[PDB]
Amino acid sequence: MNIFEMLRIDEGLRLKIYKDTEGYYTIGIGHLLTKSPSLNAAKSELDKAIGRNCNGVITKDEAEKLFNQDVDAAVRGILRNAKLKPVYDSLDAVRRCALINMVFQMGETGVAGFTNSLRMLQQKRWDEAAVNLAKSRWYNQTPNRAKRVITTFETGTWDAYKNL
């Protein structure tokens, strides 16, 4: 299993503009288009993103291209982030994937906000960190996905996804 397969399980794949769990216009593999309520603003962003008139629909290839960019930008974001980089550098390869997954879902800023949990992960206090992470709007709003990520940080294995 790798970051791509992991995120593919968590976000799903949709070839038609859709509304995410927060009600925002999304496409492909969790690619947020706009927080705006206008489906038109969404279609415009979509076209801007693919470089063609898509009329709200994209191919699998297009979805994958977007997904590659997004994973890439998530990693680069963590690496440029003064709060995130040290954590990421301290982690093993599996746990690194769990942090990338949070960043992909909630953005750099959002994750950078989990101060206490970040400190615990750095210190390698797995159990304590799994507990602190669960005390968040994130966990309450998308509990099954949060559980999988949290299990990944707790164990350092892909068990939560071997299921899936």
Side-chain angles (χ1 to χ4, degrees):
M1 166 98 16
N2 56 56
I3 189 53
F4 292 92
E5 289 172 7
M6 189 197 203
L7 282 161
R8 169 84 177 61
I9 283 160
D10 282 338
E11 301 288 352
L13 166 63
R14 298 198 231 156
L15 297 200
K16 178 97 251 270
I17 298 181
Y18 72 93
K19 278 191 206 197
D20 81 357
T21 65
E22 301 276 358
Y24 305 138
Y25 284 128
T26 307
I27 199 146
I29 304 147
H31 181 83
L32 174 76
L33 288 166
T34 177
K35 295 196 186 161
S36 135
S38 167
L39 165 69
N40 276 316
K43 288 156 110 128
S44 160
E45 283 296 314
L46 178 64
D47 286 351
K48 172 158 61 84
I50 297 310
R52 97 192 164 51
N53 251 65
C54 292
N55 177 41
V57 179
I58 66 174
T59 63
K60 188 180 178 127
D61 273 65
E62 282 171 343
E64 281 167 357
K65 182 158 225 194
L66 292 178
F67 187 32
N68 282 148
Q69 298 170 172
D70 294 344
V71 175
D72 190 64
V75 175
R76 284 179 295 81
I78 285 161
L79 308 167
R80 283 193 274 97
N81 187 299
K83 271 97 177 241
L84 301 175
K85 185 183 183 335
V87 179
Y88 187 90
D89 290 337
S90 72
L91 296 176
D92 60 273
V94 178
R95 294 184 172 92
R96 281 170 178 169
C97 293
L99 188 67
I100 294 171
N101 192 310
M102 295 182 66
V103 170
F104 183 95
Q105 189 182 358
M106 98 192 58
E108 220 200 266
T109 305
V111 178
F114 284 48
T115 298
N116 308 315
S117 307
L118 298 180
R119 200 186 73 250
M120 293 160 211
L121 289 170
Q122 218 186 319
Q123 298 172 53
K124 319 197 174 271
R125 298 164 178 229
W126 319 126
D127 59 325
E128 312 194 48
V131 163
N132 185 265
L133 277 166
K135 288 178 179 149
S136 51
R137 168 185 205 272
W138 169 60
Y139 178 84
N140 282 100
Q141 294 314 116
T142 46
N144 294 152
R145 173 190 194 149
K147 274 172 206 150
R148 289 196 286 276
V149 171
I150 289 169
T151 286
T152 301
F153 275 132
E154 216 185 351
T155 67
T157 69
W158 292 111
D159 293 346
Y161 287 86
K162 288 166 168 151
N163 270 44
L164 285 22

